[PDB]
Amino acid sequence: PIGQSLPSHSVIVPRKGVIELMRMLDGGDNPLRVQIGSNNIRAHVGDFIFTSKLVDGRFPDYRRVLPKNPDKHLEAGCDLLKQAFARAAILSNEKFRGVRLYVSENQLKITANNPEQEEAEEILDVTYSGAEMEIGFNVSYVLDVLNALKCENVRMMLTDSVSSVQIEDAASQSAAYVVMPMRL
Amino acid sequence: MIRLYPEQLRAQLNEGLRAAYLLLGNDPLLLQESQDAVRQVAAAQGFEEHHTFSIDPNTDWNAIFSLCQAMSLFASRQTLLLLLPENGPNAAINEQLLTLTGLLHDDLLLIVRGNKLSKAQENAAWFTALANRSVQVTCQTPEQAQLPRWVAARAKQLNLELDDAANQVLCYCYEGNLLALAQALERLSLLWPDGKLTLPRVEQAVNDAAHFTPFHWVDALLMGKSKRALHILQQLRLEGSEPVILLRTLQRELLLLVNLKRQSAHTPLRALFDKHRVWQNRRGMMGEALNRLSQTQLRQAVQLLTRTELTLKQDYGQSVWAELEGLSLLLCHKPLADVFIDG
Amino acid sequence: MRWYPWLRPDFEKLVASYQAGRGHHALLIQALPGMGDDALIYALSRYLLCQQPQGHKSCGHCRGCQLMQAGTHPDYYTLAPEKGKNTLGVDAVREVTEKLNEHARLGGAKVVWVTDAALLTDAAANALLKTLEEPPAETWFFLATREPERLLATLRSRCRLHYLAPPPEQYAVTWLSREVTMSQDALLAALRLSAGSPGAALALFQGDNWQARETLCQALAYSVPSGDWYSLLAALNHEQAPARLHWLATLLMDALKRHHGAAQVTNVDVPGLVAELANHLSPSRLQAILGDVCHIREQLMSVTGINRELLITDLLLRIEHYLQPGVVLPVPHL
Amino acid sequence: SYQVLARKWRPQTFADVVGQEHVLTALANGLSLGRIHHAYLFSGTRGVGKTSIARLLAKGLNCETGITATPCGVCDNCREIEQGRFVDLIEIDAASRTKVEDTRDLLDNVQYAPARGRFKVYLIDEVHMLSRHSFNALLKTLEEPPEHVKFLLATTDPQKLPVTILSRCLQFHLKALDVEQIRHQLEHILNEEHIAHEPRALQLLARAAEGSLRDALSLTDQAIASGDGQVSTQAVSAMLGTLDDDQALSLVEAMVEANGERVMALINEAAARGIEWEALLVEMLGLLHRIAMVQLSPAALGNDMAAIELRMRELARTIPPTDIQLYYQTLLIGRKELPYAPDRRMGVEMTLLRALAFH
Amino acid sequence: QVLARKWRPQTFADVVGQEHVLTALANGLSLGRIHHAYLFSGTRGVGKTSIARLLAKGLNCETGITATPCGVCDNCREIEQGRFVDLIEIDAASRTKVEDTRDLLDNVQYAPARGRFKVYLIDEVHMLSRHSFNALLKTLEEPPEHVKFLLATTDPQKLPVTILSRCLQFHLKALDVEQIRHQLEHILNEEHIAHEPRALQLLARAAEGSLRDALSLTDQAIASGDGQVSTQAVSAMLGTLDDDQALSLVEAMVEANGERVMALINEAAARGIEWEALLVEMLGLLHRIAMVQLSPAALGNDMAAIELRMRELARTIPPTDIQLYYQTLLIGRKELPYAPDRRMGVEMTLLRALAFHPRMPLPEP
Amino acid sequence: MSYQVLARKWRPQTFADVVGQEHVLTALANGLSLGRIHHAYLFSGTRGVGKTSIARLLAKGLNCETGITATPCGVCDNCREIEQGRFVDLIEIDAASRTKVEDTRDLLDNVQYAPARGRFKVYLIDEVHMLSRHSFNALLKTLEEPPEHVKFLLATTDPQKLPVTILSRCLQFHLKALDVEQIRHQLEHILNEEHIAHEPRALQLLARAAEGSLRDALSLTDQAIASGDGQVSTQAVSAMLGTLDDDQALSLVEAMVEANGERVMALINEAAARGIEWEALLVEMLGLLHRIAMVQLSPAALGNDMAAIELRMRELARTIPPTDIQLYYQTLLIGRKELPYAPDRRMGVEMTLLRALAFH
């Protein structure tokens, strides 16, 4: 939410940078301050001065990617889920880690099978109204965000049906995250 | 650097610790023989730590200890077989070769088997500081000529009589193939109870671990024996021979025949058969073919030879087997003449 | 090679054009890379990468230029062939290319120039199609060939060709002459023999090639009457056999020219010899023969496992066969 | 750098692309109907319209007006299609890639279904490059791929491309483009361009575009680049090395004159300018063809050697058919064999030599 | 759509020709002369496979072992449905590994779980690595008395001789335009889809004995169109005319025509149709004529009635002429590349034949 | 049901078992029985020599339970063990995964281990030529200074991929091709003893048909048998030989030379009927002509392996003068370039052949 309205600039930082920056935050350092320049930006954190030339070119869209009607609210605990999810993947598809979900309403249900025999099953809870979300996605992606999600009530806004599910912190909206289903 | 002939390897081996006993030569029988003699006497000489480690064309190098006082968990000198690159040690190699020369080569008693080095390698510093301590053992093969001699001494390796009548026939037919000839004498010795060579006996069973050279055919051709040469080839087939070889070798002789035919039709036969080459025995066959083979009729033949060569070699037509039947008679022109459409 | 003066005007247009973005960022310079294209190319990058600054300069100054001079210009690439090959592989390509999707990395435009695009590979080339066609930002691509023939068409669909013939023979000779002593006939004989390309013309006088040219020339004059060609095996038997094979051809051809009445020769480095060919040989067979000289020249290059010699020899005999009657005398076709 | 036209000349509708109606129609037609294959094979010359028919189709599938004969211009999906980014659509150059590796990965992502698209449409071009394995791997999903997924194959050549692949595509063979189809389209194009076109050059280019609209278009960009503005004849005739001269017949004649020198000295200078041999060759050949034709009928020709028609005629009749065939033949073989010569200049000399030796 | 796939065979019914191979299969299925190994080689039109599923389904049912043209029980049905257990289909994709072969070797050990025999089935084997070939020498050499390996190798050439010495070879061969034509009609009658025998012929002709391919072509006709299989769509998207055109011209050349020939020259140039198609077309006919010279035999399937033009031509045209021309033509073909143009080239080669006509060449002065 | 499967035995499973390949078998036992055995050896030779069948016999006499005998020992179960892997002292250690340097290191940590049954460690390493350069440093270690107990028994069918050092290092025995009679006889008695019906001629056919390999002989019997209802029937073997073979050029050569009209076409049609490449068929014809043309410039032309067909080649040759041979040859050669622009090579060929007619 914070920031300024103060101009954004093509500040497309790489992959690496963001890491050190991220590093330059933690509570620690000074607060992170930015001169967002297209040019470069000039970041202030630690005894450093971290500065990129920026790759200048667009950064692909990010509003569309939100599910089509992410709306069923799958208020779960990010953690529990993150656990359950972790377990389920094992005898889920072992390739893409594409767990398939059939979140029983208000509960949850998950049915995973690793093609290669086996199957994993969970029963968890998600305050989820609206009929089974019946969407599977790459659990490999997911957990990542659960965990980058410091928020532990994460409401998912899905459109129940093998379509994108937005997950956001339920608790704020900061972290809003979208992954996409697997196969059709 | 001292060149030694394998049979005299003991001279330098024994007398003193030669650093790099460099068995450059190529007769495998000779190389093998020069290798094991150093080793044997090396292993005996407290260098039992004996390892083989090639020197790739690759920079290679590994055990470059040559003194460091690292051991006393397993102290001793060791010895290091280097199989050389194609032409010998290259850079990196040369380098780390020149290092060893520089040091006690302690624990790295050099045994460099290989081949003849390249010149620049031999002028390359490493091959400069080995000198005077190393031993080059020429492991190069007999001429046709020295071949019987050798062969004859070599008989007594097997102690069996051998027959020099046979020796020759071995020297020709195994002209230049010491190793297999050595094994030749072995298979048959076993095969009989007696295992005594002599020519009659070596006819009855012939070592099927030792080749019947192109010569038989081509020479048969020299003569003009346009059937003889042909038969040897029926055999050269069942035998599976790569045609390349036959071509190669045939090419060798025939181009030699051209050139000698240019100068021969006015220069006594066979002198030139050895003023160049053309074995002794061939020389006759060969002095003939110049007279038989008049350089002109000879031209079209080359044109077919080339033809086949290309058929093979660019085209990988494996019908060169049939192309030759033409050529035999195209070249020979029969034992007489009988030159015909090319193929 | 080196930058020669005759690379400049090409450059200017191109940079002009480039600067005007009329000049397409692509570019193809026919001219031998032997007749200067490389330096010309790189002269361009020199500028182009530093963003094209000044109207047209090779850039002596510029950070781009100098960092490109240091080469450390990341923008900068030299993009030679791959060395695990010797042709400019796909991979080589894949890289530099993809680095340009990260924009400029130290500014100025990039210039990513192939040294001799003549030297590209196919996975490389195929790879390069889309990049040479499609313009990435600040990219000025610069390619070099012996001749345009050094490249594929689909590529050239998009090559903004900036032709560049050899400079004229005269100049190509004067240019050639400066640097190799031996008569302008040898310069020219050679130059001419080079399809008039200098860069190409020059090489001849190096080595014992042009001396062997002569050498060869001599043995042959003996060969020809004598019907011993076989003498020539060596004169032409060489790593430059094809070249020596080439030395020879241009004379055979000169003899057929005499066979069409034609003073004109491409080896003006001796006309006597030329005459005698025609002289001892009917054109039919001269002509037949001329074919084959190259053909061997080809074969020496084409046949796997081919005895250079074997081939050099067969030929002599066979010539020798032709000089001879009855021995049917071709003319080349079917 | 600096922009091209070729692309910029790529369709939005069937018209932008000249020809292949069988395909245009085949396309308009497919599209409109449920005759949407998730396997298409556009096989035509590089941007003849192998790539153009693909574009139309794309917009039409991811026409946000469904599947439509024409791609219903604008649709977001349609207009972004020819712009960067467009999730439904994922396009590919299998050129840079040769690896199978590249081929494997590709099959995996079809799963992820857009969070808003309507056919995850796949466009492979330059597939030929890819290795065998790369090829064979595609058969699997050409047959039954997951839904939305498509396989618009465009190929220059479906030849480095197995039977089974073709067996498993709609192959809309885009046939080639008539010089005129080209000239025209160009003529149309260039003129739209501010810079004065240049007919001569238009033709110079029309024939020169090599049946591919893309190049055609390319040429042009390039002609401007080095003509620094404006298409003019000369810059293009020269640019093209093209001899708008009758030197073809000149030499033919001088061969016939038994004239050695004239024929030869002329080529050599031409070689200092490196002048195109072929151009020169094709022409000679043609004349001969016609002349003989002029023998057949000095009318039933569909000859365009009219300026010299009389010359043709003249030749045609005076020289027996036979010999005409024969001239024609000699040089045809020499042309064949021209390149073979290590100066280029050398190969043509041979051709003519042999002609000149024929007379 | 994939009518190529869809229409594939599955019963003995769906196997055209190779009745000998069916008869044999039926037969060897009756008296136990079944050997472990079978080896189907042949075209991708009949499918190497189809005939295998038929064998398979004939090797095990759930009604014992009897030859069966069609599914029964499950086993057979399955088998053909690509559902049977002992089925174990052997193919390739990006797959070209050893590991694949291994498994097969392993089930040999096993006795059929549902089958009366284990019923493995390869398609074509030639994409796999060197190893897997040899791996089979072993198991093949000595196989269980309850595991059947039904090999298929389009070419038995791929397969080693020791195992091949042992194999019951069956070869599938190519299918006629007529049979194909006969077919496509039938199939297009099942999925009633318009066609015209000429379009069918044009198609049936273009297919390359691969019904599967004949079906690929029919597919892009239907799509080039909107489901039609008219001659234009077909002839255009195919780039091919009809023999008559040529024939009419040929009748023109023989007859030395220069205008007629010029005409049909242009006729061709006008249909946005190919120049050597013609050349080709012409050499074929020459030959046919010439065939018809010797026996009242050998005439086309794109002529059901221009037989007479042929008979005729065979009769009236001295053999000599027929060779000259076929020849003049053939050279056209080869040289056509260096031609300054295919049409000219085409034009010029006919000028040649005629300039050289063994009737008379062009006006010769 | 594969019925009988004889392509597993009747390669040398005993020192005497197979009556072809004696060249090796004889010196093998004189060496072995006697103590004059080497540390290391080499086997080679074409398949069906029982390539391996030899190495295994060597280990048995080392490891027999009748000492070091080359004497058969069947009551010696060592001996039986040895013929299988079962013998501890026989290691059938292969070579197809012993090709990295580490694969071989291990085998040498086991050259510190004595014959636990036999009297030689016999490491039977077969088909060797697959090893990396590094692997080849390390095997030589136990040769150069040799550990006797281990015997390394090497089989290959490519002795070239093993360095001169190693070769010089090893004693090589070379196994040859089996001849018509070798095979025939081996079978004749073996099947005579195996209670198997051998219609003699089937042998000679099969014997003739494949010479070089004993193994082959039995694989072919296996099909012959399946087709012969358990029997090596001449019917079976001719049948089998027909499956795998068709000659359409000899017949064609005859028909085209005779100027038979429709036999040529008939044949061309048959040649299409049971397909044959038209190009290959051209070439198949070409070669026949040459063969006759050579039978006329040398009976030697027909090599000894050609005895089988000499009679007809001879006779074709002699019914035809060679000029006409080179005339048709000329025609064929030309035909051969027609196939490509030939609208069909069958036609191309038929067209070609209809030209041969005119020269009869």
Author numbering:
A (entry chain G): 183 to 366
B (entry chain A): 1 to 343
C (entry chain E): 1 to 334
D (entry chain D): 2 to 360
E (entry chain C): 4 to 368
F (entry chain B): 1 to 360
Recite the paper's sentences.
Clamp loaders are pentameric ATPases that place circular sliding clamps onto DNA, where they function in DNA replication and genome integrity. Because the sliding clamp is a closed ring in solution, it needs to be opened and placed onto DNA by a separate ATPase complex called the clamp loader. All clamp loaders are pentameric ATPases of the AAA + family (ATPases associated with various cellular activities). Here we describe a series of structures of the E. coli clamp loader in the process of placing the clamp onto a p/t-junction.
In the presence of ATPγS, we obtained an ∼8 Å resolution reconstruction of the clamp loader bound to a closed clamp. Despite the modest resolution of the reconstruction, we can unambiguously identify the location and orientation of all the protein domains of both the clamp loader and sliding clamp. We observe that the γ-complex contacts the sliding clamp primarily through the A, D, and E subunits; the B and C subunits make minimal contact with the surface of the clamp. Furthermore, the AAA+ modules of the B and C subunits make minimal contact with each other. As inter-subunit contacts are necessary to hydrolyze ATP, this separation between subunits likely inhibits ATPase activity. Because the clamp is closed in this state, we attribute this conformation as the initial-binding complex. The Initial-Binding state contains ATPγS, all other states contain ADP·BeFx. Despite the low resolution of the structure, we unambiguously observe that the γ-complex initially binds to a closed ß-clamp. The existence of a closed binding complex was predicted based on rapid kinetics studies which showed that clamp binding occurs before clamp opening. The γ-complex binds the ß-clamp using the A, D, and E subunits, and with the A-gate of the γ-complex open.
